[PDB]
C-alpha cells in the first residue's frame, strides 16, 4: 500500500510543494471575484454562471446571510470565495465557529486580522502534516473593527494572507487588477465604490449592458444602532453605529446599474 | 522542631535544632535539618522529614540540570518557584512541609518560605515549626539590620536555645549556618544542655 | 529483483529474501563455538579495543552473539526479564526448553508484519537445569536447534569440520579436555588465541554461569 502513496506533504527539488501550486491553478480558473475598500465600507462583487430558466430559490427566511458567492461569518465580517465549493463550506464552518467562540469567551467581537490568521493556520496544517490533499480555496474577507477600521484581506492556498485597497481573484484577474489600479482613489464613497465594481465586472465578463441576473454584490457598512434597553441591561453601552453585512437585491442595484451604463456610454464616445 | 532564618547586612543566618518526635517517643536526637542543596543554596525541613528530604533532593537535581544547559547558576527566585509549583500540584494529596530556601545571587541575599499548599513568601525573617512560637519572642527583641556576623550568630543560637527549653518537640543540638557572597559556611554545633550552663548566670 | 525488499513478500519459488539477507548478518559476525559433555557446557568467542560478545542471562544460563550487537542487547534484556519473573513466581530456575521457545517465537513475530524488521543476530544459548546441560542455536528466521556441538560466524565451517571429528568422544571427556576441544575448534576459524582476544565461559553441575578471568584462562592459553 505504501508504493501507491502520492506523498502530498513531501518537498520536491527546489523547495517546492507541488500540490499547493496545483491547487492555486484551480483558483485561477474560477468565477471572478472583486473587492473594494471605500470610506463608507467594503464592497464585494462576483460574476455568477449562466442563468438557466429551471433554477430555483431555496426561499430562506433571512436574505442577508448567504448568496451563491457571498457568506456572512459574523455581524462585522463577510467573505467571498473562489475555488472548490465544497471545500469552501468546510472552511466557512470553521471560521463561523472560531469567531463565535471568541465572542463566548470575551463577550466582544473577534478582530478581523485575527480571524484571517486562524483561517490561514488551518490551511497551512494540511500542507505539512497528515498525508492528504490541501484545500483548494481563496477568500476575500471584509471586516470592521475598533483597531483598524474597514479592512479587506485575501488568503491563498499556501496559507498566506495580505491586505489590499482593491483586489481581484479568479478568471480575468490581471485585466480587473489593471482597471482598478487606474480608477481607485482614497476618497471613494460606498455608492461610487459599487459603481466602480459593476464596471470592472462589466469589462471582464465582456458584455455592453450589465445583466442584473449575472452579478452579485455585498457590502460591509455601518448603520444606526437599534434598541438600547437600559432597563434590562443597566450597564450596557452601545455606540451610535454598528457594522452590518448586507447582500444587495435587484431593487437596490437598479439605479446603480444605470449610473454604470451611462459612464460606459461616455467612455465609448471619447474613443 | 524549630527552625529560623533572617537577613541582615552581612547575609543570611539559618539555625535549627535536631530532635525527631511523633509526639511522645523521641526517635532521634541527631537529625540534620539543614539540607545542603548544592554549594550556593540551603533548605530547611519542618513537617514530614521524608517529604522535605525527597523533594529537596529533586530540587537539587533541577538546579544542576539548569547549570549544565545554561552555563550559569539558577537564581533563588527561580529555585523557590520550582519547589512551590511542585507543592501546589500536590496540594490535595496530603504533604506536610514547611521549608525555607536561602541563597545569595546577582540581586543579593534572598530568603523565601515555601509550604505544602503552594504558599511562597519573601521576607526578612521567619521561624517555622512547633517551637516557632517561642523563638519569635527572643528574636523580635534582638533583631536589627546592622548586626555584625558574630552578634547575629549569637542571637540565632540563643533563640533556638529558648525554644528547646520550653517545647517538648524541640531539643538536641543547635546548628548555625551563614549564607554569604562566596556561598555558605557551617558556623557552629552545640548541645543545648552545654548552652544552658553558659547562659544561666 | 522484485521480491527482495520487504519481509511480507513471498517470491515465486516460495522464498523469503529479506529473511535470507538478515541471516547473512550472522554469517559475517565474528566466530563463536559451543560444546557439551554429560554435565557442562562451554562457550568460546573471538573478542579481540574490547568488544562484548558474551552475556549472563540468569544464574543458570548465558549466551554468545554474532551479528548486530544492538539486536543482541535487545534480546538479552528480554530473556533477563523473563527469567526474573519466572523466579519471582516459582522460586526456581526458568527451564531451558521454555527459554528457547519464547525466543524463537519473538524472532518469528518480526518476519511476518511490515512494521517490524527481522533481528539480524544469532545466539548460542548455554545452560544447566534439572534435566542437565543444554546448548541451543537461534537464527533470524525464527528456527531453534538443540545441539551437542556447533559454531556460528565467519569461517565457522572450519570449526564445524573439526567438531564433526571429535564430538562423539565428548560425553566421556572431563571439563578440562572439553575446554581444550572448544579452543582448538575456534582456532580453526582463525593471529593466534591469547587471553586478551578470547573469552571462555562455563556453566554446569555445581557451577553457575561464569566467564573466566584472565588469571583462570592462563591455564588453557
Amino acid at each position: 500500500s505504501s508504493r501507491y502513496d502520492s506523498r502530498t506533504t513531501t518537498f520536491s527539488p527546489e523547495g517546492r510543494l507541488y500540490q499547493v501550486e496545483y491547487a492555486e491553478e484551480a483558483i485561477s480558473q474560477a468565477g471572478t471575484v472583486i473587492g473594494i475598500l471605500t470610506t463608507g465600507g467594503v464592497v464585494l462583487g462576483a460574476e455568477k454562471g449562466v442563468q438557466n430558466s429551471l433554477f430555483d430559490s431555496e426561499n430562506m427566511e433571512d436574505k442577508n446571510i448567504s448568496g451563491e458567492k457571498m457568506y456572512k461569518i459574523a455581524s462585522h465580517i463577510g467573505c467571498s470565495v473562489a475555488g472548490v465549493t465544497s471545500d469552501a463550506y468546510a472552511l466557512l464552518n470553521y471560521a463561523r465557529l472560531s469567531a463565535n467562540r471568541h465572542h463566548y469567551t470575551y463577550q466582544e467581537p473577534m478582530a478581523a486580522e485575527d480571524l484571517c490568521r486562524l483561517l490561514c493556520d488551518e490551511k497551512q496544517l494540511y500542507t505539512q502534516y497528515g498525508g492528504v490533499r490541501p484545500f483548494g480555496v481563496s477568500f476575500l474577507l471584509a471586516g470592521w473593527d475598533r483597531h483598524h477600521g474597514y479592512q479587506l484581506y485575501h488568503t491563498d492556498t499556501s496559507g498566506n494572507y495580505n491586505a489590499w485597497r482593491a483586489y481581484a481573484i479568479g478568471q480575468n484577474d490581471q485585466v480587473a487588477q489593471s482597471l482598478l489600479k487606474r480608477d481607485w482613489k482614497p476618497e471613494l464613497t460606498l455608492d461610487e465604490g459599487i459603481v466602480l465594481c459593476l464596471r470592472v465586472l462589466g469589462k471582464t465578463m465582456d458584455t455592453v449592458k450589465l445583466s442584473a441576473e449575472r452579478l452579485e454584490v455585498a457590502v460591509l457598512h455601518k448603520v444606526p444602532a437599534p434598541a438600547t434597553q437600559k432597563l434590562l441591561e443597566p450597564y450596557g453601552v452601545l455606540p451610535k453605529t454598528v457594522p452590518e453585512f448586507k447582500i444587495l437585491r435587484e431593487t437596490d442595484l437598479k439605479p446603480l446599474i444605470a449610473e454604470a451604463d451611462r459612464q460606459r456610454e461616455a467612455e465609448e464616445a471619447a474613443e | 522542631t524549630t527552625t529560623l532564618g533572617f537577613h541582615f547586612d552581612g547575609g543570611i543566618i539559618l539555625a535549627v535544632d535536631s530532635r525527631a518526635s511523633s509526639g511522645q517517643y523521641i526517635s532521634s536526637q541527631t537529625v540534620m535539618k539543614v539540607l545542603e542543596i548544592n554549594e550556593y543554596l540551603l533548605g530547611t525541613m519542618a513537617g514530614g522529614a521524608a517529604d522535605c528530604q525527597y523533594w529537596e533532593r529533586v530540587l537539587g537535581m533541577e538546579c544542576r540540570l539548569w547549570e549544565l544547559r545554561n552555563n550559569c547558576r539558577i537564581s533563588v527566585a527561580a529555585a523557590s518557584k520550582i519547589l512551590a509549583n511542585i507543592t501546589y500540584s500536590y496540594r490535595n494529596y496530603g504533604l506536610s512541609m514547611g521549608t525555607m530556601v536561602a541563597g545569595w545571587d546577582q540581586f543579593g541575599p534572598s530568603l523565601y518560605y515555601v509550604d505544602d499548599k503552594g504558599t511562597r513568601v519573601k521576607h526578612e525573617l521567619f521561624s517555622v515549626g512547633s517551637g516557632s512560637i517561642y523563638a519569635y519572642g527572643v528574636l523580635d527583641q534582638g533583631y536589627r539590620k546592622n548586626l555584625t556576623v558574630e552578634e547575629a550568630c549569637e542571637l540565632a543560637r540563643r533563640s533556638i536555645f529558648h525554644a528547646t527549653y520550653r517545647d517538648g518537640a524541640s531539643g538536641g543540638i543547635v546548628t548555625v549556618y551563614h549564607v554569604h557572597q562566596g556561598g555558605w559556611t557551617q558556623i557552629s554545633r552545640d548541645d543545648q544542655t552545654k548552652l544552658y550552663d553558659r547562659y544561666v548566670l | 529483483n522484485q521480491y527482495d525488499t520487504n519481509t511480507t513478500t513471498w517470491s515465486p519459488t516460495g522464498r523469503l529474501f529479506q529473511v535470507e539477507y538478515a541471516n547473512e548478518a550472522v554469517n559475517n559476525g565474528s566466530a563463536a563455538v559451543g560444546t557439551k559433555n554429560k554435565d557442562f557446557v562451554v562457550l568460546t568467542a573471538l573478542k579481540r579495543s574490547y568488544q562484548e560478545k558474551v552475556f549472563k542471562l540468569d544464574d543458570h544460563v548465558g549466551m554468545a552473539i554474532a551479528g548486530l550487537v544492538a539486536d543482541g542487547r535487545m534480546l538479552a534484556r528480554f530473556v533477563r526479564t523473563e527469567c526474573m519473573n519466572y523466579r519471582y513466581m516459582h522460586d526456581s530456575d526458568n527451564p531451558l526448553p521454555l527459554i528457547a521457545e519464547i525466543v524463537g517465537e519473538k524472532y518469528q513475530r518480526h518476519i511476518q508484519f511490515a512494521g517490524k524488521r527481522p533481528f539480524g543476530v544469532g545466539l548460542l544459548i548455554a545452560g544447566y537445569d534439572s534435566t542437565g546441560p543444554h546448548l541451543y542455536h537461534t537464527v533470524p528466521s525464527g528456527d531453534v536447534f538443540d545441539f551437542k556441538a556447533t559454531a556460528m560466524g565467519l569461517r565457522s565451517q572450519a570449526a564445524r569440520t573439526y567438531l564433526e571429528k571429535h564430538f562423539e568422544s565428548f560425553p566421556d571427556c572431563g571439563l578440562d579436555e572439553l575446554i581444550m576441544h572448544a579452543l582448538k575448534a575456534l582456532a580453526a576459524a582463525t593471529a593466534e588465541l591469547n587471553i586478551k582476544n578470547t573469552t571462555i565461559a562455563i556453566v554446569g553441575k555445581g557451577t553457575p554461569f561464569m566467564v573466566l578471568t584472565e588469571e583462570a584462562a592462563r591455564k588453557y592459553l
Partner: protein
C-alpha cells in the same frame, strides 16, 4: 492505509472526482418536478431478467415523514448516504421537536460527500441524489453531486437519458402547474427515454403533498399510467 487517494493534477483538476461523476452519469434515469403545491420524483427500475423479483427493488426512499430521495449511479454507495440522512433527521427531532428543514438536510449530506474527497484511504461516492421535501418555507427539490456541490431546481434529471429529459422538461414546464399535472408530466418525460414498455412494475414514483412524502404503490401507479 491513511494517505489520500484524491489529489490535484497539473492543470488544477481533481480527477477522481470527475471519474466518480462519470459513474453517476451512467446510472439509470431519475427525475423530479416541483409543482406549486408539491413535488414528484420518479425513476426507472428495469431488472436484468424476469428471474429477479421486481417488487423488492427500491429506487425511491423515505428519509422521514416529510422528505424523500432518488439516485443514479452506484446503488451500494447510495445506501450509505440514505442511512446517514435518516439518522440526521431523527437527531434533529430529538433536539428541536420539529422536522429537519430540507435545506439543512442537504447541507448535512453534502458535507459527508466532501469528506470522502479529502480523507485518507477512501475514494469518493459514485452517485448523485435528488432530494424532495416540504417544510415551513414550502416545497423543495435539490440535486447533490459527488463533489458535494448542490443546487435547487424547479425540474431536472440525472443519469443516462438526462440531457434529452432536461430539454423535454424545459419546453413543458410552467410556474402554475398543479400537483396532478406534474405527476402526468414526469411520467411522460420518462416514457420518451425509456427502452421498451413502461409498466407500473418497472418504474417507481414518490410524491410530496400536504406536507407529507409518500411512495406510490403499484396499484396507484397503474391508474396514472392508464391516463397518459
Amino acid at each position: 492505509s491513511a494517505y489520500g487517494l484524491t489529489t490535484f493534477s497539473p492543470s488544477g483538476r481533481l480527477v477522481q472526482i470527475e471519474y466518480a461523476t462519470t459513474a453517476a452519469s451512467k446510472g439509470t434515469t431519475a427525475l423530479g418536478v416541483k409543482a406549486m403545491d408539491g413535488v414528484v420524483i420518479a425513476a426507472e427500475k428495469k431488472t436484468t431478467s424476469p428471474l429477479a423479483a421486481s417488487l423488492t427493488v427500491q429506487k425511491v426512499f423515505v428519509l422521514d415523514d416529510h422528505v424523500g430521495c432518488t439516485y443514479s449511479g452506484i446503488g451500494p454507495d447510495c445506501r450509505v448516504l440514505v442511512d446517514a440522512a435518516r439518522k440526521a433527521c431523527q437527531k434533529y427531532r430529538l433536539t428541536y421537536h420539529e422536522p429537519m428543514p430540507v435545506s439543512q438536510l442537504v447541507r448535512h449530506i453534502s458535507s459527508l460527500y466532501q469528506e470522502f474527497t479529502q480523507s485518507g484511504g477512501v475514494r469518493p461516492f459514485g452517485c448523485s441524489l435528488l432530494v424532495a421535501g416540504a417544510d415551513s418555507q414550502g416545497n423543495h427539490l435539490y440535486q447533490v453531486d459527488p463533489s458535494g456541490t448542490f443546487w435547487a431546481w424547479k425540474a431536472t434529471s440525472i443519469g443516462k437519458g438526462s440531457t434529452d429529459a432536461k430539454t423535454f422538461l424545459e419546453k413543458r414546464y410552467t410556474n402554475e402547474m398543479e400537483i396532478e399535472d406534474a405527476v402526468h408530466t414526469a411520467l411522460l418525460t420518462l416514457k420518451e427515454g425509456f427502452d421498451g414498455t413502461m409498466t407500473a412494475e418497472n418504474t417507481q414514483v414518490g410524491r410530496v403533498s400536504e406536507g407529507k412524502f409518500e411512495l406510490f404503490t403499484v396499484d396507484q401507479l397503474k391508474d396514472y399510467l392508464d391516463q397518459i
